[PDB]
């Protein structure tokens, strides 16, 4: 399976605009990820990381994005907060693994890398793995509004990038390797 292609990618999207890579019809070697020091966080939900090689799935979805370290914790089931609520949500259910690493020497810049954005205003929260990449000035009561007039605010903001690159493996013809 094309794991390195996702984890070692040179470019990641913003959280609000998270990208989904579908992994299927392949052998998933999780040993490379499992026992590596690459990740600062390796969190699985109801799934034993050590046993990932022994689990078959219809497919695996690797959701890739960059989020501030502080908000990495929001990428989990049963969470609230600006990311959990408006940018990227995980369902209240079992989940595969949320893998993340420090990218201060990759994405962060001395003046702040503001190339990455996030959502903070929306007419309701996101559904599990919903992607909202619209950009219409927020209006508190559904009315038409034009910025920078009163009550007219852009729903998106910028990240003051320390950033972490996060890849979430959501599980649904892909299995781990066999032992000879």
């Amino acid at each position, epitope marked *: 399976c094309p794991f390195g292609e996702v984890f070692n990618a040179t470019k990641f999207p913003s959280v609000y605009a998270w990208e989904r890579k579908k992994i299927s019809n392949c052998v998933a070697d999780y040993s490379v990820l499992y026992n590596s020091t690459f990740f600062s966080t390796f969190k699985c939900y109801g799934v034993s990381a050590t046993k990932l090689n022994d689990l078959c799935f219809s497919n695996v979805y690797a959701d890739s994005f960059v989020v501030k370290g502080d908000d990495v914790r929001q990428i989990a089931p049963g969470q609230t907060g600006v990311i959990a609520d408006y940018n990227y949500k995980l369902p209240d259910d079992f989940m595969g693994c949320v893998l993340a690493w420090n990218t201060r020497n990759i994405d962060a810049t001395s003046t702040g890398n503001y190339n990455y954005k996030y959502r903070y205003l929306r007419h309701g929260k996101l559904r599990p793995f919903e992607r909202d990449i619209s950009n219409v000035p927020f209006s*508190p*009561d559904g009315k038409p509004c034009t910025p920078p007039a*009163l009550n007219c605010y852009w729903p998106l903001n910028d990240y003051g990038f320390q950033p972490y690159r996060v890849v979430v493996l959501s599980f649904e013809t892909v299995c781990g390797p066999k032992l000879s």
Partner: antibody
Amino acid sequence: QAQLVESGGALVQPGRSLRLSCAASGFTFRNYAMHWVRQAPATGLQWLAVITSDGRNKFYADSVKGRFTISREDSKNTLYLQMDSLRGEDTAVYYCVTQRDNSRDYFPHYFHDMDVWGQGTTVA
Amino acid sequence: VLTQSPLSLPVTLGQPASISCRSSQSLVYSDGDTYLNWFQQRPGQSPRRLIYQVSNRDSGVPDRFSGSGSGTDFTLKISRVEAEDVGVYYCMQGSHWPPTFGQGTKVEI
């Protein structure tokens, strides 16, 4: 033990400006959204405006939008209301209002509690 | 818009009371909750919250206070009105911006 104390109320002639202040204590001012609400027989309790914790966004009721400005000085833990072109209809007791629960400090959640009220200052 | 009823509720000291509040629109928010709160204002003083989310008491609020309701129709219930309860009860909705209050119900002793 959040506490709000309003001051700067006065009699204002039509068309004139008045600025109210509200001293906050018992909580970290910087970590909470702040609101102004006014009371009058005409409207009962009427919400006017909110300023977010970072002082960046400001939302206003149609009844005052374009005339009132909400602002805050974090360094003094003080909330202000700038009432320009004040009208007779603006006669009311102005309350400084906030909330104790800031676990969701984002729109519109700071309107859900509004459980912290000051003494209220009369403006006419 | 929130409308309370009756506007004036004369309650013999020690007797129960009930203040209604009807909204012009369902107060259920986008997350399925209902942000309909009740406040009590003593003459000469500010409003204080007693009930939140239609029926939940705030810490420090006497057990004589409760409530119920759904959709548009909500009620503030008092098992017995005390002399200290004299004042105006308000309903407040935060579900739809801008947040609004009812006209308030005066409860007399």
